[PDB]
Structure formats: C-alpha cells, structure tokens
Structure 1
Amino acid sequence: VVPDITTRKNVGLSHDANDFTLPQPLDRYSAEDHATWATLYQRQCKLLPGRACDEFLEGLERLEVDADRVPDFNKLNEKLMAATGWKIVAVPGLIPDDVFFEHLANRRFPVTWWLREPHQLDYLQEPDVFHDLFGHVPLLINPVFADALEAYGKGGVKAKALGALPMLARLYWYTVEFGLINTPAGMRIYGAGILSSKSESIYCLDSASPNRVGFDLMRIMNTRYRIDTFQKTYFVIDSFKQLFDATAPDFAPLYLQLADAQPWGAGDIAPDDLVL
C-alpha cells in the first residue's frame, strides 16, 4: 500500500473538518501543472466544438477560464458570482455526498484543487481541478442549469434522512456528470465527466454502442452506474428547463418506492424507456 494521489497532493495542508474546504493553495502549482492545464485545455477546446453544447463553450469564455495556467478560484468567482450568485470552493478531492449536496444547496461548487500529473494526461480516475473546474463550472453561468444544481443540493437533506443519497447521486451522475442534451443541430454534451474526457466525448455521440435514453427521473434514480468505464447508457434532456422542472415534486415517495426495487444495471434498457 502506497499513498494515493489525493493523499500525496494534500501533504502539509488541512481542510475544514465539517465542510471539507480550504483556501486554494496557489503556491503549490508548479510550472508542470500550468503546462498540464494548458495541454488539457487545448486538447478539449480542439475536440469539443460540435460536440459540447454551445452554452458550455460560451461559459468558458464568459468566466474567462485561463487557457494557459490553473485558474485562480477567487478571480473566477468574481465573474461567476455576478452571473448566478454561485462560487467555487476548493476541496482536497472526493468529499462525502452529504457535504457535497450541502455545498450545492448554498450555491457553492466544490472543486478539487490539485491537478493530475502529466503521465495521467489521458485519464485520471479521481476528480482533479481540470475535471472539476473545466468540466463542471462553465455551465454554472446558465441560470436554469444553476437553479437545477441548487435544487439537487437542497434535496440532500431529505435524501440523507431517508437513506436515499445514492438515489440522488444517480440523478447527479446521469445529468451533471454524463448528461446529453438534444438540439435541432443534433445531440450535444453537457455532462462534465464527458466534457473533460479525451475519448468519451467521441464515443458518446459517434458510437452506435451506447444506449441514448430520454430523461426520466424515476428510471434514472433506479439506475446503477460504473465509474471505471465509459457509460453504457446516456440520458438525454430536451432542455435545462427539463432538469430544473424534474426537481419540482416531492422526492420522498419516489425514494420509498425505489427502496425495495431492483435497480437497472448500467447497460439495461427498461421496458418503458424512450430509446433515441
């Protein structure tokens, strides 16, 4: 057993014991880190036109996400706060789900502060600052998307009280992390896990292999996912409004009905799916 990357990167740093935040450690970014950031940024910006939803590419520009260095979170926050009242907060790496949703409930988006090493350029399993900031943050300037996230966050309390955090986590995964959005110009991507990826960005739109299924709240909350492979199923929304509107009803009876149900496997098609 050797220390994992999260442990190694955080040596000598602390974090709040309750909310897991710390000030962004600006001094810890090396020349190599800025170069790695610049390489990832350039790679994604070459790949994503015609694949990412237009709002994502626009958000990168409106927030002035740096092309050439790891961004200063405080500086980005000036723009994000003026747009939708959100801010990003630095965290050490993966945090508990209850803490994560509590941040979202308060319009704080947690971002892992450290970056993958150059040898991990192609892929990192852990979240890092490229995935969290480049992948997740640009859409937070869209007020409908931002409201959906806040609503997910507020749902954390009820989910925790009912032992249903994993059901809310599935909704988050299949929307915020791996969601597709249909447009008159064809299918586009809004999931951050795809937007920061070297290759999943290609597969999710070009391959006949994955299922593309119309968004359905109950179906999604009853669907397993895997973290270590490309998604076998992507869920497709018509608009960010659909995401927000999905949060309108009381989730409590949905959780209880699902508590004793057998969940769908990551690759299953349910009898009632709208398959696209």
Structure 2
Amino acid sequence: FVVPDITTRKNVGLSHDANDFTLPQPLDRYSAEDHATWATLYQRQCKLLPGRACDEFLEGLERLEVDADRVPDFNKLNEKLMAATGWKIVAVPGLIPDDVFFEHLANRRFPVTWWLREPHQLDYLQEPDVFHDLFGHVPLLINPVFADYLEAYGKGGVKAKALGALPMLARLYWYTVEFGLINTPAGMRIYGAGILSSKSESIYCLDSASPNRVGFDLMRIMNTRYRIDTFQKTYFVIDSFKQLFDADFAPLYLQLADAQPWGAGDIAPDDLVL
C-alpha cells in the first residue's frame, strides 16, 4: 500500500493511446481552483523573467498569447503554434517512455502533461505538469533554430541504438532544453524550461556564486550526471541557438560508453568557465 502519485490520481477514468500515449485534453477536469493556480503561476513568472529570460522566450509568450488567467485550451493554442512554427502540442497523462517522446519530437509534436499542480505544491516539482510544459517549454518554439534543434534531437533519439545512448541523450536534453543558459550582448539569460517555469531556479541560476557556469560542449554534457531534487550544480551556456542546432551521434555514444561520467558539480580540464 502506497501513496499514489499525482499522475495516477488525475488520470482516474481516463484512457491514453497504447502506442503514442496521447489523449484528448480533458477540459472538464480543470476546477475553478486550477484556473486560479494557473493565473498565480503565470503572474509570478512574468514578474521575474524581465532581465532573466532570453528575448526569444518572451517573444513566444506574446506571439502565442498563452492564456494568463486560465489553463489554456490546447486546440486553440495549436492554431497559432502550427501556423507560426509547424509544431503542435499533444496531451499526455504525464511522463511517457523515452522512445515515444523522441518519436513525437521527430514529428514536430510536443507532449504536454495535461493536469496542473495542486495549490500547495507550486514548486520543487520534478514531474512535468501543464504549467511547466506549456509555459516553460512551448514558447521557445517561436525561434525556428530552436524548433529545428528539438526536431533534430528527436530524430537522433529515434535512431539511437547503442547501449548507453539513452542516459547520454537525457543529459543533453536536461542541460539544454530543461536547464540551459545563453550568453547575450545584454548579459547572461535563460532558455531552459525547468528554469523558466520555476520561481526559485529563475533567481538562483543568474544570482549565485556556488554553481559552475560552463561553456557548451556536446561530448562533455553527454558525459555529465545531473540531479533532480536540488538546484543545479552546473549550468551549460550556449552562445547562440545556431550553436545548439549545429551540434550522427552513433560514434559519440561509442566513444563515451566506457567513460566515467563527470559528477554534477565537477569541472573538467577542457572546460571554459565563467
């Protein structure tokens, strides 16, 4: 007998596709309380991100008109997202298998957990919810180079076979799409979704002496461990989304397969550090 997780409780009486894990967005299951939780999260993040989020993120939020006051209707959002970027969101019950995830990204589908966090649980979150996925991840698709990066990432994941590739690709996604920073002429800014949807990470990642801030390096990153239950110990910094995009992985998985991974707090001899 155990504490059910929120994914299980939210999805009772609900089905999902056996192959691709999608379902129609269950609009009737958001409460008044949920729409208030959404508005509170949205308003809080939008006061923190001036000076912090990269310009492209802020542009996406505006161009997509992500709702400020209610959990968005995914079909309505998709009208704008498809026209502007060629991508669509699909509702998923929560975390889905890695192979299923890659197949969606490879086909310009972004999986979004449909349910929302409960009020006393507005942060420290580990599992995605609809605020993290829709507010954190989706707006950055307005940058076509980042969108193409995500599609390419997915196609690479579909193709990956070598033992050890899945952790390597998870680390790459984590230190870019979830927790990446970008150097800009106006100063260091944020692009990672796990930062942008979090009050605490948004502040910490640009205002703390403890973590390392390391220039992006693909092979380094694929061989670096990460932690889920704490603030990050290293952030990787890109100079441009083109650098990310410009980054066949098959020989790379083999080069790194027997390698000892770097710890989440380590500095490697070839790193460039801030």
Given the two structures, how large is their TM-score scaled by the length of structure 1?
0.97
Alpha carbons 2:99, 2:157 under 8 Å: kept:
yes
Segments of 5+ residues of structure 1 without an aligned counterpart are: none
Q: What is the CA–CA distance in structure 2 between the aligned matches of 1:188 and 1:181, rounded to whole Å? A: 5
* 1:141 alignment counterpart: 142
Within 5 Å, give how 1:52-201 maps onto structure 2.
52-160=53-161, 162-201=163-202
Q: What is the CA–CA distance in structure 2 between the aligned matches of 1:146 and 1:161, rounded to whole Å? A: 26
- Secondary structure at the counterpart of residue 110 of structure 2: strand
Alpha carbons 2:162, 2:253 under 8 Å: kept:
no
Q: What is the CA–CA distance in structure 2 between the aligned matches of 1:202 and 1:64, rounded to whole Å? A: 24
Alpha carbons 1:159, 1:168 under 8 Å: kept:
no
* 1:202 alignment counterpart: 203
Quote the RMSD (CA, aligned, Å).
Answer: 0.9
**Cα deviations by residue, 1:19-49 (Å, 9 ceiling, x for unpaired):** 1110110000000000000000000001111
Residue 270 of structure 2 is aligned with which of 264, 269, 272? 272
Q: What is the CA–CA distance in structure 1 between the aligned matches of 2:223 and 2:132, rounded to whole Å? A: 26
Q: What is the CA–CA distance in structure 1 between the aligned matches of 2:78 and 2:201, rounded to whole Å? A: 29
Alpha carbons 1:175, 1:235 under 8 Å: kept:
yes
Segments of 5+ residues of structure 2 without an aligned counterpart are: none
- Secondary structure at the counterpart of residue 206 of structure 2: helix
Q: What is the CA–CA distance in structure 2 between the aligned matches of 1:184 and 1:81, rounded to whole Å? A: 31
**Cα deviations by residue, 1:39-77 (Å, 9 ceiling, x for unpaired):** 000000011111000111110110010000000011111
Q: What is the CA–CA distance in structure 2 between the aligned matches of 1:226 and 1:105, rounded to whole Å? A: 26
- Runs of 4+ residues over 4 Å off in structure 1: none
Which shows bigger deviation, 44-53 or 117-126?
Answer: 117-126
- CA drift of 1:159 comes to 2.0
- Secondary structure at the counterpart of residue 160 of structure 1: coil
- CA drift of 1:163 comes to 4.3
Given the two structures, how large is their TM-score scaled by the length of structure 2?
0.98
**Cα deviations by residue, 1:124-164 (Å, 9 ceiling, x for unpaired):** 22110000100000001110000000000000123245441
Q: What is the CA–CA distance in structure 2 between the aligned matches of 1:97 and 1:140, rounded to whole Å? A: 20
Alpha carbons 2:162, 2:250 under 8 Å: kept:
no
Which shows bigger deviation, 154-163 or 105-114?
Answer: 154-163
Alpha carbons 1:93, 1:113 under 8 Å: kept:
yes
Alpha carbons 1:92, 1:112 under 8 Å: kept:
yes
Alpha carbons 2:59, 2:142 under 8 Å: kept:
no
Q: What is the CA–CA distance in structure 2 between the aligned matches of 1:177 and 1:197, rounded to whole Å? A: 11
Identity %: 100
Q: What is the CA–CA distance in structure 1 between the aligned matches of 2:211 and 2:257, rounded to whole Å? A: 27
